[PDB]
Symmetry: D3
Subunit: 228 residues, 6 copies
């Protein structure tokens, strides 16, 4: 059994959603999955496996930051995960992005040290698996949910980035900041698995507004993993 | 008029293909466009504008390397270019890529100093415009041409990269190596234009020569056709 | 109220223990504290406050990695935390360290991107508050549990470090690897609060599994007792 | 035959001038060389060979940027080139440089990614071959053309450098900016050939044409000396 | 015989003080040691050995900067040095430090190229040997000499650092700047020897005020090396 | 008065030789200068001023390493130094260089942290003043002393460089390693003064000891003669 996600291969489905908040993992499992079973609660990394339209799907908590996410992804891959889609929130890098809007991550600027360590400081362009990316985009359109498609930036120091710095990055295509995508994308290529990310804007660097965005994001992710 | 591409607005169309070789730019203009007109020859950066299925389309030589490509892209944008698609050859990093095969660039690892200077050494993920990327992929599928979709790596030193380094990069998703995409993708975001890149594999890293001129030529034709059909969609 | 640790200033004590595992935080609170109350469970970041030998003490989950720990530390300071001692596990880099042994962190090699971001890539020597460090060392000596005093390395990629690399770092003084110390130490100086870290060796770099639960749990108990005794000394 | 400069060893002389612009390569050939002949036009990298005062001299287009120049220099070396002198224009970083003024490059600050890739990010001091440098300086003095001897900076992003940054570099000895010297100098040492660079200030970050003419005359006289 | 410190086995004691100034090395030897002897003067790196309270103790000039200090340390270690304590001055980065005040270095921010070369550019946290560090702190206390315990920054370009930059570093815990500690600490760990550093504030980025500081500093270092 | 070189404007001439070893500075002052006077001995940074062929020349000890040399150069400039030429020894990186052979430094690879700090990590090409460089070269040729003209590398960690790394650098043009030139050259441009460097090979990297004092001493003599002649010509 893996060190942090203490489960066995048979407990995890090939298709996995990756929320950062365990509270959100629980909500997703109970709201969208049939017969959800929590296969792991060790370290608070709540992980569930259930069925969505007859297809097994797991929802695994990653925690915050690429170091935590990388540990979870590495172990999930060992457990048989083949398609992994991060679902979470992100702070808008510019004033034009309103809370609740969806972002299909086309790539992730690696401002984190986890990718840096794996890469030994070499340049890189973290991108999702092309088919998963395409599926997320298509499903968002099919469901008629407004969304943006583009870059996000994965950072390490939540409280270091100033609003001015965020807007500076926006001039380079960065739509929002989060703390997990870059590592997920890198590991997707390193470990030969398919990955993707879709986010809901929670603030610009409204209870029902954000929640509806999260619900849409999850629905899109679930529909997309069934497409691959 | 710009310093290098000495054209005047009106000469350049909103949609532009970006081959690296001027001889290829000429061939593209005469082979696919109706009423091809050369608007620039300064510094050998041959540029043409003609009609493709009734739509204005320019073909502009970028030269080799991101510094050259960046100068050309910057000036084209200043002239009103809106959609720019690089078309060229690339060296396969894996043994899974057969010569003549097409690669729709999903992103470009920035191993070049041009993006580095523009970014002041900061990390970045050079990616094409999502719509252009999608169009290139869809067109390749519609025309039934075999293709791979994924990362390429943009380098500065053509003769520095070894087969060992190439295979190492392939383990991180790099399909092939070329020398212009990263800067094109970065400028696309910086200057607000829609960019993309589609390449034809001309060889494997470490090869003294390029694949058969025939197998490559058919790849170049397909690549160009896909690019043309794509820019019309955006 | 803070974004992640959703508590109110009155909920958190000046003295706080920082385990990485929420299950460990719960065990510490229930095992060592009188009148323990959980003031936060949002994001699974379980935080408790109780009394230890008549002195208020909080136990706050940090999660794994400096990005998570930094968020928790920044918010804890806003909530009134003044003395923060990390208590966690570490993978021995040397063969000299055995599972269950304690390590009082004299400093932390910053192999993480969180300190790097705060420092804008500049060099630094993450070190605990001197008084806290002194108290942890003194208490470890007094209790008599096997321990070492020295450097640890705070890394981001748990699964990237090979046994070969670990041994190389040991030649430079690194006793073990963990994933939070560097950021805590940096923030201690930046925010003007007193920090420290004591760890229990849970394995050797390269091991597929952690040491026997019995061994590991005893090491954890010893480490917490030392930390609790130490925070009362400052 | 090399991949980009599709020439034969017999086509390239031991002494080569390296202009960046093909139109300038042509002008140099037809203006200074006897019986000039073009041995390559592939990829627009026009290369010519002719006689200068009875000595064979080639004029090869490098294109813009160190990546393009490195490809050209690597191939020229494989073709037998022994002495390579870059001739081109530069953007003055300092105010004391007037348009048309000549600069004999003593060294080149490597702000480019090509030298960075060859060096794997390690520090370096790109310098020309001692003898070629000495000859360029001496010839510029003989012909009596106003010149300066010092550092230039080779960059990748033509449109990224601001006047403020240029002025900052000038405080460290940078006289002007260009985009090829660093890689040429590095390859000179790496490949065992003699390189040098002389430039004509075309701007501040027939005036320029005369500078170009003087620049070329100096280079031709200098390569004959080595 | 070593290349720079041209001494031989038998000239250097296991316990060594490392002043940067040769004039100070001389003063220390004549002032605190019995039957002092200068075993080296080559390159001005004056080195002496004598007895302090019956214990052999060497006083070796390091010169200025980590490159010079690394050379001296490497050679001293080869000659038998096992406990090395740097004694010297530093420029206060903060406004709370008064000239002559003592600083027991808990660690040294590596802003130098010597440590960088040895480490091949990798991150590091230069710290003294814990026992020596502890001894210096304890002796300063026992002797009742006012002292501060914390970080110093080891730099290469004495004249490049501005008061503004110094103040910035102070906000990160840097008490003062000097030019030798980082390399001493790194080599201590690399060569398996015990090192430490105690400094007297000489300025901020009075003769007897500083001299008394220097005297207290040396006395503390001497007592500390006998303690380990 | 400067902090380290405790002298005053009057003690130092416009022309200065910069040996690293104070014992060599003394030997030079007494062997080539007339009416030599030592104006500083603080920190063992022995500095003398006398007349060479009726011209005032100073000989100032720099110490070892760019940090020490940088301090000395900065203060010398404040004291009125206008032409400064380093004279010292170097470890051959190549196998073709023989102990005692001279090297006129055309440039210095900056592998040191001093220039890095001054430059804030930016790339640079440390070079001497062109006229001083020319003077040294011409003088060496005139006197007919065997010499080489080219790059040296200025390093910080004398004991870190291996023969293997030295040989690798030789393939990129590095003739020998030393520890001061890069900073001297950089400050020359920064402070607007004329600098240069001429060295005598004292050993080949990897050698436990230097070459015979005889062979080496003669090299040192020629080097100083060349340097002294040169400074009087600019």
């Amino acid at each position: 059994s893996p060190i942090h996600v203490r489960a066995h291969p048979g407990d995890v489905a090939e298709r996995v959603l990756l929320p950062g908040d365990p509270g959100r993992a629980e909500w997703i499992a109970k709201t969208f999955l049939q017969n959800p079973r929590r296969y792991n609660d060790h370290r608070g990394l709540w992980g569930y496996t259930g069925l969505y339209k007859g297809v097994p799907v797991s929802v695994q908590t990653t925690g915050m930051g690429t170091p935590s996410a990388a540990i979870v992804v590495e172990e999930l891959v060992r457990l048989g995960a083949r398609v992994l889609v991060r679902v979470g929130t992100a702070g808008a890098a510019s004033s034009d992005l309103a809370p609740g809007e969806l972002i299909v991550a086309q790539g992730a600027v690696p401002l984190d040290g986890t990718t840096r360590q794996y890469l030994e400081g070499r340049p890189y362009a973290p991108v999702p698996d092309p088919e998963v990316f395409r599926a997320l985009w298509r499903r968002a359109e099919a469901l008629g949910y407004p969304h943006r498609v583009g870059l996000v930036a994965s950072e390490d120091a939540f409280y270091a980035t100033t609003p001015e710095e965020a807007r500076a990055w926006a001039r380079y295509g960065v739509l929002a900041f989060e703390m997990e995508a870059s590592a997920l994308f890198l590991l997707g290529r390193m470990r030969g698995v398919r990955t993707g990310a879709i986010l809901a804007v929670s603030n610009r660097i409204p209870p029902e507004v954000l929640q509806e965005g999260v619900r849409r994001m999850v629905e899109v992710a679930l529909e997309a993993v069934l497409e691959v």
